């Protein structure tokens, strides 16, 4: 089969169907937007893996905008990597570009403004 493609930590998102679906759930969701043709994606990956640890509370999607345009039109997305946060079907913020650490502080300042 080759499986757990991506790592483990990381759901794979396949349509906007399910897209649409996981960022309904009351949980904070970060989809990483990714492609191969891509460098900054590349250099993103492993700070990534490391975020994913640091907040076992969010899940992170991934979404390959090759295999997912209308999801990558829907969401007026122009740039890679991008990230889109969102809970509870709300939309809650956004980093472009292959910038780790403003997703972390983005990550804080939602999670923040959660507890209120």
Same mark, same amino acid.
């Given at each position: 089969?080759?499986? !757990? /493609?991506?790592?483990? *930590?990381?759901?794979?998102?396949?349509?906007?169907?399910?897209?649409? /679906?996981? @960022?309904? @759930?009351? =949980?904070?969701? &970060?989809?990483?937007? #990714?492609?191969?043709?891509?460098?900054?994606?590349?250099? =993103?990956?492993?700070?990534?893996?490391? $975020?994913?640890?640091?907040?076992? *509370?969010?899940?992170?999607?991934?979404?390959?905008?090759?295999?997912?345009? !209308? $999801?990558?039109?829907?969401?007026? &997305?122009?740039?890679?990597?991008? #990230? =889109? $946060?969102?809970?509870?079907?709300?939309?809650?913020? /956004? &980093?472009?570009?292959?910038?780790?650490?403003?997703?972390?502080?983005? =990550?804080?300042?939602?999670?923040?403004?959660? !507890?209120?």
């Amino acid at each position: 089969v080759l499986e !757990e /493609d991506r790592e483990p *930590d990381f759901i794979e998102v396949t349509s906007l169907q399910e897209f649409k /679906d996981i @960022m309904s @759930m009351d =949980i904070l969701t &970060v989809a990483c937007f #990714w492609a191969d043709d891509c460098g900054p994606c590349k250099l =993103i990956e492993e700070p990534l893996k490391k $975020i994913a640890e640091d907040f076992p *509370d969010v899940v992170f999607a991934l979404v390959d905008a090759d295999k997912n345009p !209308e $999801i990558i039109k829907e969401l007026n &997305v122009k740039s890679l990597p991008t #990230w =889109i $946060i969102a809970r509870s079907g709300e939309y809650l913020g /956004d &980093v472009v570009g292959a910038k780790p650490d403003l997703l972390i502080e983005k =990550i804080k300042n939602i999670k923040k403004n959660l !507890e209120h």
